Design a protein around this ligand. Structure first.
Ligand code: MN
Ligand code: MN
Length: 393
């Protein structure tokens, strides 16, 4: 019954109806797919069509939802499997598209690099559309929450399998997690992974993933799988030796405390915005820095030791729906990550056992009415849970 993994063909139809319920009479939405594979997600959200060199048109000729028309121009079944009301070859674009534009007053199309995009743009009231769909994508349906839970569950269990094994080089740990994501049931990597051991964890954008791992440092890993186009996002940090030292413990619990207290905020009744939570993450991280006695270091305030945001919306993209307001209260159905971090520089003004230690703990949280749902709860992160899996398996 599914059209793409986790989503039925009925929901795709319902998504196109929800968009049409916002359009005036004699409108048409034009979405150009990608070329050679990562489909255009606005197109994928409404069609489930995952092929290159394709154009979708959603047309509302009157004010009745029963008159809408779902056009699909594909490379030379689309009507029977994807429920396209009309279809034609993509070669017919120059003869097919102008007939539709001329009979409509409002053209929903983003004028700002696909080949069919430059084609359609040259043919051209023009209104943007990608942001209006973003307001729909930021609210996940129960089916979408289920398929994301499956992605995070597969990714989470893959981390636990890695916890029980010893890795002498980053690239082995990289290829291992990739295989477990795929054999666990995922389509691909959700994003380019980070496998940073020791001082490598201080580079926020480290992706080389080929350095040797030593028995005295911890490894920071940001990696997760994708299923049906939906992405998970997990970060974990654990010692290579398999046991936390007293220093590695104190720093890890600081990041874990900030993350835990922030996850507890993700209830829609709290009326917090994503930025509201981030500013609370700064406050909490300051207090943890004070508990460790490293908050008042000159030139290294909390912004330089915690130098990124608390998280981001998650969905078809890793950094999902970027065009939605970070300042409006979180609504039921949104999926955001909670990923605070600490990264101590190699400065003698810091204790020696803290220098060159970077830590980040990331989980995917879905917003509920009076609670939340940890979509990545399987990947253990408590020190006693971590040390148990590492030494016993
Ligand atoms: Mn991440
Ligand atoms: Mn993230």
């Amino acid at each position: 019954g599914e059209l793409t993994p986790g989503i039925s063909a009925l929901e795709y139809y319902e998504r196109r109806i929800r968009l049409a319920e916002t359009l005036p009479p004699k409108s048409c939405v034009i979405l150009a797919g990608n070329d050679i594979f990562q489909q255009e997600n606005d197109l994928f959200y409404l069609s489930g069509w995952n092929e290159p060199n394709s154009v979708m048109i959603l047309e509302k000729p009157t004010d009745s939802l029963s008159d809408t028309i779902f056009h699909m121009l594909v490379p030379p079944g689309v009507q029977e499997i994807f429920n396209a009301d009309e279809s034609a070859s993509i070669n017919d674009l120059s003869k097919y598209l102008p007939k539709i534009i001329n009979r409509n007053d409002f053209i929903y199309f983003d004028m700002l690099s696909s080949s069919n995009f430059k084609h359609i743009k040259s043919l051209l009231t023009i209104k943007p559309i990608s942001k209006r769909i973003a307001e729909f994508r930021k609210i996940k349906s129960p089916q979408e929450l289920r398929i994301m839970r499956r992605a995070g569950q597969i990714s989470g269990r893959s981390f636990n399998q890695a916890f029980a094994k010893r890795f002498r080089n980053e690239r082995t740990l990289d290829s291992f997690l990739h295989y477990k994501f795929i054999s666990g049931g995922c389509d691909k990597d959700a994003y380019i992974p980070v496998v940073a051991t020791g001082s490598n964890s201080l580079c926020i954008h480290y992706t080389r993933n080929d350095d040797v791992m030593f028995d005295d440092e911890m490894v920071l890993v940001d990696a997760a799988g994708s299923l049906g186009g939906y992405c998970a996002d997990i970060s974990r940090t654990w010692p290579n030796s398999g046991k936390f030292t007293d220093a590695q413990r104190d720093l890890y619990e600081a990041v874990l405390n900030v993350q835990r207290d922030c996850i507890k905020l993700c209830k829609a009744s709290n009326n917090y915005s994503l930025h509201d939570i981030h500013e609370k993450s700064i406050t909490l991280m300051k207090q943890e820095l004070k508990n460790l006695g490293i908050d008042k270091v000159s030139g290294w305030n909390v912004e330089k030791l915690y130098p990124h945001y608390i998280g981001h919306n998650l969905g078809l993209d890793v950094h999902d729906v970027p065009k939605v307001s970070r300042y409006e209260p979180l609504k039921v159905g949104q999926v955001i990550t909670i990923e605070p971090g600490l990264y101590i520089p190699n400065e003698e003004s810091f204790p020696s056992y803290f220098r060159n230690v970077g830590i980040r703990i990331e989980d995917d949280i879905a917003i509920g009415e009076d609670t939340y749902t940890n979509l990545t709860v399987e990947a253990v992160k408590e020190i006693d849970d971590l040390e148990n899996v590492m030494q016993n398996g």
